[PDB]
């Protein structure tokens, strides 16, 4: 795969090559791939190759990465949660995966 | 995703954000997501977003988390197994994934 | 599973037994297995056992392996990307998963 706007990768603490799970709100597909850096500021969320069987243009998707860490660290760990607008621009960054803005 | 009663998360040694596999007894669906803390004592098992394609209200589900650990530790490791009643209240906590109460 | 030409395993930094994800360009199948060393220089990409339900002879596939590593290392990590020709011979090796030759 998935090509992500560099701005979105930075906002979400995703590195080029980092494993990424994609889930599709529209059809319920779930798959695992890796991030590819997309043109900064373009808003690209591009699905390449095999994954285009499961994800289609215009779909609403969630992108997820996981970390493995010591138990002690996991108890204080804070995720990077990035809410985007209709143009895939980051409008809110926080700790709560269930937070919705406005 | 999955919103879990805080009482159930504590009983099962699940942290907010911890990866969780869900398997559905009724339809056989299997998916991977993360835990979101639900209102303590409410009995909430809530399926949010994309996963609602695969899991439906009233379904019986199993929630599973895994740990990675040194071989030496794994030989003495004891899981946290939480059996719940019809209202998602914890009625038994033990080491045996196959134990059933009464 | 998947039997891979030893030349391709070496080119891609895959060890015998290493976990491997296979995605199928033709039908969109996605599965996880491990690498088995194939006869060096034969061009074998062989799908054995259960995975032959999902992958068929003549399909175009992508083979992927992941590594787990410290955050500091991940920021400078460079993958091994192997582009092959119509006979599964390695024609290009680089760092960019999205690079296509000629």
């Amino acid at each position: 795969x998935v090509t992500i706007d560099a701005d979105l990768m930075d906002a979400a603490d995703l590195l080029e090559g980092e494993q990424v799970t994609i889930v599709d709100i529209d059809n319920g597909a779930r798959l695992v791939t890796y991030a590819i850096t997309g043109e900064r500021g373009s808003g690209v969320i591009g699905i390449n190759g095999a994954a285009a069987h499961l994800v289609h243009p215009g779909d609403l998707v969630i992108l997820i990465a996981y970390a493995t860490m010591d138990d002690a660290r996991a108890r204080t760990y804070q995720p990077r949660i990035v809410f985007v607008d209709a143009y895939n621009k980051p409008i809110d960054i926080g700790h709560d995966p269930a937070f919705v803005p406005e | 995703x999955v919103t879990i009663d805080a009482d159930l998360m504590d009983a099962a040694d699940l942290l907010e954000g911890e990866q969780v596999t869900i398997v559905d007894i009724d339809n056989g669906a299997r998916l991977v997501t993360y835990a979101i803390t639900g209102e303590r004592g409410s009995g909430v098992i809530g399926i949010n977003g994309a996963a609602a394609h695969l899991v439906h209200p009233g379904d019986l589900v199993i929630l599973i988390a895994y740990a990675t650990m040194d071989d030496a530790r794994a030989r003495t490791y004891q899981p946290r197994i939480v059996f719940v009643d019809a209202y998602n209240k914890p009625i038994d906590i033990g080491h045996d994934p196959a134990f059933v109460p009464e | 599973x998947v039997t891979i030409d030893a030349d391709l395993m070496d080119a891609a930094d895959l060890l015998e037994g290493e976990q491997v994800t296979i995605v199928d360009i033709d039908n969109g199948a996605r599965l996880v297995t491990y690498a088995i060393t194939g006869e060096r220089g034969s061009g074998v990409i062989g799908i054995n056992g259960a995975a032959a339900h999902l992958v068929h002879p003549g399909d175009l596939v992508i083979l992927i392996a992941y590594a787990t590593m410290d955050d500091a290392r991940a920021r400078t990590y460079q993958p091994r990307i192997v582009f092959v020709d119509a006979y599964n011979k390695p024609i290009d090796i680089g760092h960019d998963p999205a690079f296509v030759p000629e």
Partner: peptide, 24 residues
């Protein structure tokens, strides 16, 4: 002992393109 924890989420993103022949 190691736990697997959510670390990044980008949510309700709109797929801008999706095609079998694009590589990245």
């Amino acid at each position: 002992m190691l736990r697997t924890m959510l670390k990044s989420k980008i949510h309700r993103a709109t797929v801008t393109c999706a095609d079998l022949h694009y590589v990245g």
